[PDB]
Design a protein around this motif. Structure first.
Motif, PDB file in Angstrom:
ATOM      1  N   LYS C  44      65.821 -34.736 -51.345  1.00  0.00           N
ATOM      2  CA  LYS C  44      64.779 -33.830 -52.360  1.00  0.00           C
ATOM      3  C   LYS C  44      65.561 -33.277 -53.358  1.00  0.00           C
ATOM      4  O   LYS C  44      65.865 -32.905 -54.402  1.00  0.00           O
ATOM      5  CB  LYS C  44      64.369 -33.072 -51.509  1.00  0.00           C
ATOM      6  CG  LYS C  44      62.834 -33.435 -51.263  1.00  0.00           C
ATOM      7  CD  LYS C  44      61.848 -34.052 -52.354  1.00  0.00           C
ATOM      8  CE  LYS C  44      59.986 -34.457 -51.693  1.00  0.00           C
ATOM      9  NZ  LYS C  44      59.334 -35.131 -53.127  1.00  0.00           N
ATOM     10  N   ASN C  45      67.143 -33.095 -52.554  1.00  0.00           N
ATOM     11  CA  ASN C  45      68.313 -32.303 -53.462  1.00  0.00           C
ATOM     12  C   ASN C  45      69.462 -33.018 -53.061  1.00  0.00           C
ATOM     13  O   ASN C  45      69.683 -33.822 -52.369  1.00  0.00           O
ATOM     14  CB  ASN C  45      68.026 -30.649 -52.570  1.00  0.00           C
ATOM     15  CG  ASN C  45      68.541 -29.746 -54.149  1.00  0.00           C
ATOM     16  OD1 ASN C  45      69.454 -29.424 -53.888  1.00  0.00           O
ATOM     17  ND2 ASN C  45      67.918 -29.757 -54.819  1.00  0.00           N
ATOM     18  N   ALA C  46      70.792 -33.130 -54.065  1.00  0.00           N
ATOM     19  CA  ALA C  46      71.862 -33.653 -54.104  1.00  0.00           C
ATOM     20  C   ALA C  46      72.804 -33.089 -54.880  1.00  0.00           C
ATOM     21  O   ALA C  46      72.483 -32.669 -55.460  1.00  0.00           O
ATOM     22  CB  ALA C  46      71.647 -35.410 -54.355  1.00  0.00           C
ATOM     23  N   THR C  47      73.826 -33.766 -54.384  1.00  0.00           N
ATOM     24  CA  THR C  47      75.138 -33.285 -54.632  1.00  0.00           C
ATOM     25  C   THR C  47      75.516 -33.872 -56.156  1.00  0.00           C
ATOM     26  O   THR C  47      75.452 -35.100 -56.120  1.00  0.00           O
ATOM     27  CB  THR C  47      76.723 -32.907 -54.660  1.00  0.00           C
ATOM     28  OG1 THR C  47      76.589 -34.318 -53.141  1.00  0.00           O
ATOM     29  CG2 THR C  47      76.028 -31.876 -53.111  1.00  0.00           C
ATOM     30  N   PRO C  48      76.025 -33.251 -57.125  1.00  0.00           N
ATOM     31  CA  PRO C  48      76.330 -34.421 -58.420  1.00  0.00           C
ATOM     32  C   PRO C  48      77.164 -35.271 -57.673  1.00  0.00           C
ATOM     33  O   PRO C  48      78.335 -34.711 -57.038  1.00  0.00           O
ATOM     34  CB  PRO C  48      76.570 -33.500 -59.485  1.00  0.00           C
ATOM     35  CG  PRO C  48      76.391 -32.043 -58.950  1.00  0.00           C
ATOM     36  CD  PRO C  48      75.392 -32.124 -57.460  1.00  0.00           C
ATOM     37  N   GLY C  49      77.252 -36.023 -57.964  1.00  0.00           N
ATOM     38  CA  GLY C  49      78.370 -37.543 -57.680  1.00  0.00           C
ATOM     39  C   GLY C  49      77.469 -38.056 -56.446  1.00  0.00           C
ATOM     40  O   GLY C  49      75.809 -37.417 -55.844  1.00  0.00           O
ATOM     41  N   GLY C  50      78.998 -38.617 -56.090  1.00  0.00           N
ATOM     42  CA  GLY C  50      77.944 -39.481 -54.354  1.00  0.00           C
ATOM     43  C   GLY C  50      77.527 -40.439 -54.674  1.00  0.00           C
ATOM     44  O   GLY C  50      76.654 -40.678 -56.000  1.00  0.00           O
ATOM     45  N   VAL C  51      76.914 -41.256 -53.413  1.00  0.00           N
ATOM     46  CA  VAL C  51      76.571 -42.219 -53.656  1.00  0.00           C
ATOM     47  C   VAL C  51      75.021 -42.624 -53.777  1.00  0.00           C
ATOM     48  O   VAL C  51      74.209 -43.241 -53.945  1.00  0.00           O
ATOM     49  CB  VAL C  51      76.893 -43.543 -52.283  1.00  0.00           C
ATOM     50  CG1 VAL C  51      78.347 -43.253 -52.077  1.00  0.00           C
ATOM     51  CG2 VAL C  51      76.241 -43.010 -50.489  1.00  0.00           C
ATOM     52  N   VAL C  52      74.319 -41.085 -52.705  1.00  0.00           N
ATOM     53  CA  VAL C  52      73.075 -41.086 -52.923  1.00  0.00           C
ATOM     54  C   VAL C  52      72.884 -40.214 -53.592  1.00  0.00           C
ATOM     55  O   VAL C  52      73.069 -38.508 -53.412  1.00  0.00           O
ATOM     56  CB  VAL C  52      72.393 -40.610 -51.528  1.00  0.00           C
ATOM     57  CG1 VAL C  52      71.116 -40.589 -51.393  1.00  0.00           C
ATOM     58  CG2 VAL C  52      73.257 -41.769 -50.517  1.00  0.00           C
ATOM     59  N   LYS C  53      71.620 -40.458 -54.613  1.00  0.00           N
ATOM     60  CA  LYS C  53      71.523 -40.179 -55.547  1.00  0.00           C
ATOM     61  C   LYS C  53      69.574 -39.191 -55.002  1.00  0.00           C
ATOM     62  O   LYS C  53      69.072 -39.935 -54.185  1.00  0.00           O
ATOM     63  CB  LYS C  53      71.069 -40.584 -56.983  1.00  0.00           C
ATOM     64  CG  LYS C  53      72.769 -41.199 -57.510  1.00  0.00           C
ATOM     65  CD  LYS C  53      73.040 -40.183 -57.662  1.00  0.00           C
ATOM     66  CE  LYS C  53      73.126 -40.950 -59.596  1.00  0.00           C
ATOM     67  NZ  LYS C  53      73.060 -39.606 -60.340  1.00  0.00           N
ATOM     68  N   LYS C  54      69.109 -37.522 -56.206  1.00  0.00           N
ATOM     69  CA  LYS C  54      68.185 -37.415 -55.811  1.00  0.00           C
ATOM     70  C   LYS C  54      66.950 -39.070 -56.476  1.00  0.00           C
ATOM     71  O   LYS C  54      66.772 -39.956 -57.277  1.00  0.00           O
ATOM     72  CB  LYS C  54      68.170 -36.375 -56.895  1.00  0.00           C
ATOM     73  CG  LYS C  54      66.481 -35.974 -56.933  1.00  0.00           C
ATOM     74  CD  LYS C  54      66.701 -34.831 -58.328  1.00  0.00           C
ATOM     75  CE  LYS C  54      64.864 -34.422 -58.407  1.00  0.00           C
ATOM     76  NZ  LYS C  54      64.415 -34.134 -57.117  1.00  0.00           N
ATOM     77  N   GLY C  55      65.626 -39.236 -55.184  1.00  0.00           N
ATOM     78  CA  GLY C  55      65.295 -39.637 -55.015  1.00  0.00           C
ATOM     79  C   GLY C  55      64.843 -40.816 -54.432  1.00  0.00           C
ATOM     80  O   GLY C  55      63.845 -41.704 -54.870  1.00  0.00           O
ATOM     81  N   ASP C  56      65.850 -40.935 -54.087  1.00  0.00           N
ATOM     82  CA  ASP C  56      66.482 -42.541 -53.143  1.00  0.00           C
ATOM     83  C   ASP C  56      65.638 -42.299 -51.912  1.00  0.00           C
ATOM     84  O   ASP C  56      64.940 -41.274 -51.500  1.00  0.00           O
ATOM     85  CB  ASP C  56      67.475 -42.501 -52.916  1.00  0.00           C
ATOM     86  CG  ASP C  56      68.610 -43.114 -53.940  1.00  0.00           C
ATOM     87  OD1 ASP C  56      67.636 -42.959 -54.938  1.00  0.00           O
ATOM     88  OD2 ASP C  56      69.893 -42.482 -54.026  1.00  0.00           O
ATOM     89  N   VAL C  57      65.014 -43.293 -51.722  1.00  0.00           N
ATOM     90  CA  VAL C  57      64.284 -43.553 -50.719  1.00  0.00           C
ATOM     91  C   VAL C  57      65.360 -44.509 -49.314  1.00  0.00           C
ATOM     92  O   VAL C  57      65.266 -45.699 -49.331  1.00  0.00           O
ATOM     93  CB  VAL C  57      62.834 -44.721 -50.244  1.00  0.00           C
ATOM     94  CG1 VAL C  57      62.512 -44.634 -49.295  1.00  0.00           C
ATOM     95  CG2 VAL C  57      61.871 -44.219 -51.701  1.00  0.00           C
ATOM     96  N   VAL C  58      65.784 -43.629 -47.615  1.00  0.00           N
ATOM     97  CA  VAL C  58      66.735 -43.982 -47.596  1.00  0.00           C
ATOM     98  C   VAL C  58      66.264 -43.964 -46.150  1.00  0.00           C
ATOM     99  O   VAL C  58      65.452 -42.958 -45.604  1.00  0.00           O
ATOM    100  CB  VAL C  58      68.151 -43.508 -47.820  1.00  0.00           C
ATOM    101  CG1 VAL C  58      68.248 -43.386 -49.364  1.00  0.00           C
ATOM    102  CG2 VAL C  58      67.814 -41.910 -47.191  1.00  0.00           C
ATOM    103  N   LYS C  59      66.885 -44.428 -45.323  1.00  0.00           N
ATOM    104  CA  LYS C  59      66.965 -44.637 -43.437  1.00  0.00           C
ATOM    105  C   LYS C  59      67.991 -43.197 -43.305  1.00  0.00           C
ATOM    106  O   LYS C  59      69.491 -43.084 -44.004  1.00  0.00           O
ATOM    107  CB  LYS C  59      67.802 -45.785 -42.964  1.00  0.00           C
ATOM    108  CG  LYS C  59      66.832 -46.878 -42.999  1.00  0.00           C
ATOM    109  CD  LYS C  59      65.429 -46.628 -42.236  1.00  0.00           C
ATOM    110  CE  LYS C  59      64.237 -47.959 -42.635  1.00  0.00           C
ATOM    111  NZ  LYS C  59      64.922 -49.142 -42.150  1.00  0.00           N
ATOM    112  N   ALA C  60      67.558 -42.331 -41.835  1.00  0.00           N
ATOM    113  CA  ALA C  60      68.727 -41.313 -41.813  1.00  0.00           C
ATOM    114  C   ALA C  60      68.183 -41.630 -40.009  1.00  0.00           C
ATOM    115  O   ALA C  60      67.165 -41.964 -39.693  1.00  0.00           O
ATOM    116  CB  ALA C  60      68.240 -40.289 -42.392  1.00  0.00           C
ATOM    117  N   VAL C  61      69.507 -40.977 -39.413  1.00  0.00           N
ATOM    118  CA  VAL C  61      68.889 -41.088 -37.680  1.00  0.00           C
ATOM    119  C   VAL C  61      69.169 -38.844 -37.580  1.00  0.00           C
ATOM    120  O   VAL C  61      70.043 -38.684 -38.517  1.00  0.00           O
ATOM    121  CB  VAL C  61      70.503 -41.213 -37.504  1.00  0.00           C
ATOM    122  CG1 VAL C  61      71.368 -40.931 -37.264  1.00  0.00           C
ATOM    123  CG2 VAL C  61      69.785 -40.988 -35.801  1.00  0.00           C
TER     124      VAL C  61
END
Ligand code: MG
Lengths: 175, 37, 122, 215
Positions: C44-61
């Motif tokens: 829901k919130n991302a830093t400008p840059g980085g590999v993961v962008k806002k809106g992505d559907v990802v796995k997390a632990v």
RNA sequence: UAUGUUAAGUGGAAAAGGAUGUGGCGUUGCCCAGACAACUAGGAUGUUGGCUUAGAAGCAGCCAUCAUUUAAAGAGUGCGU
RNA sequence: UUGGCACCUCGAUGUCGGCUCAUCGCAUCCUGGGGCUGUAGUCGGUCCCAAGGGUUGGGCUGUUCGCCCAUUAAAGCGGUACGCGAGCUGGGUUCAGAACGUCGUGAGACAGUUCGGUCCCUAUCCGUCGUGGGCGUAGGAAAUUUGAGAGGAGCUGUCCUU
RNA sequence: GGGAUAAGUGCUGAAAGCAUCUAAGCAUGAAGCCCCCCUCAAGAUGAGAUUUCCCAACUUCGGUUAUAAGAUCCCUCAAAG
């Protein structure tokens, strides 16, 4: 019943006791006791037995042919004996005895044990050719079926416990 | 096995038999085994 | 006790700052997840840059929930904030610089790359 | 084999070797006595009848269960034992191993035995559908007038009746419950206490029956 | 009571079709010169000769399909590609 | 299912969805057992036996349906007044208000939209869930019981080894 | 984990001197059936069983008192309502 009437029975140095309906056949390798069809009549000459049906009703002429061959089986198995031989095909398929028992390693991650029964002997040769021997055909056949049912042959390379001289339909599936 | 209302020979080696009240076909080709009739 | 629609702070430098859980993996009817459980989530919130962008559907632990975990000796550990780390489907992190304390219960789930990369394992 | 009768004292916790929290239930099993031997040729089945606790002797003009009546005193005097408050019997035991009048002692169990414990659950009284049967409740808002009622009790004119076992409100609790595959943690012979792992049915100071796991 | 039928609880719901279930009547051709059975007895020849077809000689298709070693023999009844 | 018929009901048999609670069938979605395969194994395909248990949470619509997002061993199909409003709701639908398009000279109308719009009932009987009293069980009691019968449970994933 | 089965797989075997799981006979085979596990249960009017307790004195013949063993009324309560 040409089986029943035409081909008469020919005992050879055996003792058959037509004890009423209950028949008892003994010879070199043991004694067998079976209870044959009640209505049928039995005529016993010097070392010869013949089965006679009452009416020619389909039922009577069916039990006649059955209970002549059943007694023929007793005399032939007690005078000669019955054997069934099973071949084991497959890399790593072995057969070894463990004392009145038979152990098979047919690639199952666990050995398979069949305990022998009364009047039945197992034997092995070249660690492949299993042999079941006995007087009773109806029990040697049962044991041979049980042993081959552990792993019946497969169509793509023939591996498994097959009857010796049993045609295996072989397919040609490809890797 | 084929279980169908029409059990008939498919080959010349097919046999029609009756087991336990059912009309079946047994053949050395396993594709031709049929059960009900 | 993390369920669906639960917001979580992300404790790595992957790029994601917050995620919302779409589903807790592991079975039909499974409702909640604690440390060592894997979730699917949307950032829901991302830093400008980085590999993961806002809106992505990802796995997390999940690391360091505030519901905490019981241990076999009867000792409990609780944290101040729910947290999670985005994983690369081999139970390995996407970030390189995991931040914040991490529960020791992740060592069992074979998140050894996460466990070794954390400043404090408790 | 090897059953016993006792009463539940409460729950506590012990630390095992390697130090794990083991919740335990304290069961006090004292003055257990074999009062009868049921035998197939006399009763149709073999069992041992075990009496537990200790009633006071018969008295004239007793007004409560504290004192044995004449039928109970005579029954417990046929063996050589005091009147007992709880009498049960056990089928899993070997009757020949036991003798009438002998004392079933606490150390018949050894730590690590796997047991089945039978009690009468805690009473709850008249309770409704959502607590007695775990049923979900209706909406609490959105104009709803369905909060803790049971739902439909059936269909429409086909049926025209409610089937047996509809899960409707009623008296909760007080049932015989058996918990299976619990294990004894330790035995205290001087205090006559068995520590069972976990919890058992019933109120404190109730009655529990411990016997060997049937599985 | 007499004589037969049914083995399916048919009797005590259905159809096209399928079937060595079973009984009756008639026709009909094989036969102790000995059919029908596996009758564990032989099975091949010049010769796939000719179109010979992916080379393919009972299978990709036109068969030309000659007499029999022979008590009975098909340029192969037939499973095959 | 869409219909046909007009046989019960108009001195009333409340109609869609959802909620709550289920219950049954098997033409079986998963799991169990098989035969055949143009089945090498893991994957499948098709047919047979099997109803024991199980058979997800969201976005959009009043929606059922459907599409989509993530799961799952699987997200089964049907009956029970398209189960269940004297158990709940009231978004749709079907009074009275108003408006748009359209039709009508008009009053007004449309199964065309749009905003709004009272859901009554203290349970007699059967039925059902819990609890008592009476008598019986050929003397009067206390306790411990057998089990004719009845109900309950019945699911399944992943990893390691071989 | 037992017992019996379904689809299936068979062994022996004639009908049909062959073949054939079937007719006679003998196996094997499912989360399903019966038992096993949990709970209720003799109003189970078929009302069961075991252990123990109580046991007289009038009758003018019990259609008999009142009492035993045991309960209760009433009272203090809760682990129960
Ligand atoms: Mg009326």
């Amino acid at each position: 019943s040409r089986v029943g009437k035409k081909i008469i029975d020919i005992p050879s140095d055996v003792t058959v006791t037509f004890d009423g309906n209950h028949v008892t056949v003994k010879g070199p390798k043991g004694e067998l006791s079976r209870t044959l069809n009640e209505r049928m009549t039995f005529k016993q000459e010097e070392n010869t037995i013949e089965v006679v049906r009452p009416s020619d009703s389909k039922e009577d002429r069916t039990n006649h042919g059955t209970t002549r061959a059943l007694l023929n089986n007793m005399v032939q198995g007690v005078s000669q004996g019955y054997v069934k031989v099973l071949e084991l095909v497959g890399v790593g398929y072995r057969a070894q005895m463990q004392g009145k028992d038979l152990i098979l390693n047919v690639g199952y991650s666990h050995p398979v044990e069949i305990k022998a029964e009364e009047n039945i002997t197992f034997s092995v040769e070249k660690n492949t050719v299993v042999k079941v021997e006995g007087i009773s055909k109806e029990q040697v056949g049962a044991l041979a079926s049980n042993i081959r049912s552990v792993r019946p042959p497969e169509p793509y390379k023939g591996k498994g416990i097959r009857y010796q001289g049993e045609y295996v339909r072989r397919k040609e599936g490809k890797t | 096995m084929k279980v169908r209302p029409s059990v008939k020979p498919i080959c010349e080696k097919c046999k029609v038999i009756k087991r336990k009240g059912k009309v079946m076909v047994i053949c050395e080709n396993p594709k031709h085994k049929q059960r009900q009739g | 006790m993390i369920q669906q629609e639960t917001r979580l702070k992300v404790a790595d430098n992957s790029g994601a700052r917050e995620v919302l859980t779409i589903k807790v993996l592991g079975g039909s009817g499974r409702k909640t997840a604690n440390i060592g459980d894997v979730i699917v989530c949307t950032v829901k919130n991302a830093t400008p840059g980085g590999v993961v962008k806002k809106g992505d559907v990802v796995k997390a632990v999940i690391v360091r929930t505030k519901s905490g975990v019981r241990r076999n000796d009867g000792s409990y550990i609780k944290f101040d904030e729910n947290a999670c780390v985005i994983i690369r489907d081999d139970k390995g992190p996407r970030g390189t610089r995991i931040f914040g304390p991490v529960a020791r219960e992740l060592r069992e789930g074979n998140f050894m790359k996460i466990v070794s990369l954390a400043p404090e394992v408790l | 084999t090897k059953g016993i009768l006792g009463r539940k004292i409460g729950m506590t916790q012990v630390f095992g070797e390697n130090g794990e929290l083991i919740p335990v239930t304290v069961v006090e099993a004292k003055e257990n006595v074999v009062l009868q031997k049921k035998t197939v040729e006399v009763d149709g089945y073999n069992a041992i009848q075990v009496g537990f606790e200790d009633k006071k002797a018969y008295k004239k003009d007793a007004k409560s269960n504290k004192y044995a009546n004449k039928p109970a005193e005579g029954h417990a005097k046929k063996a050589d034992a005091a009147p007992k408050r709880f009498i049960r019997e056990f089928r899993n035991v070997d009757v020949d191993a036991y003798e009438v009048g002998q004392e079933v002692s606490v150390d018949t169990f050894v730590a690590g035995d796997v047991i089945d414990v039978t009690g009468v659950s805690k009473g709850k009284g008249f309770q409704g559908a959502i607590k007695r049967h775990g049923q979900s409740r209706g909406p609490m808002s959105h104009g709803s007038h369905f909060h803790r009622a049971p739902g439909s009790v059936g269909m429409a004119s086909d049926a025209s009746r409610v089937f047996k076992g509809q899960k409707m409100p009623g008296r909760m609790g007080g049932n015989t419950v058996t918990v299976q595959n619990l294990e004894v943690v330790q035995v205290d012979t001087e205090n006559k206490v068995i520590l069972v792992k976990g919890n058992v049915p019933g109120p404190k100071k109730g009655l529990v029956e411990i016997r060997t796991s049937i599985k």
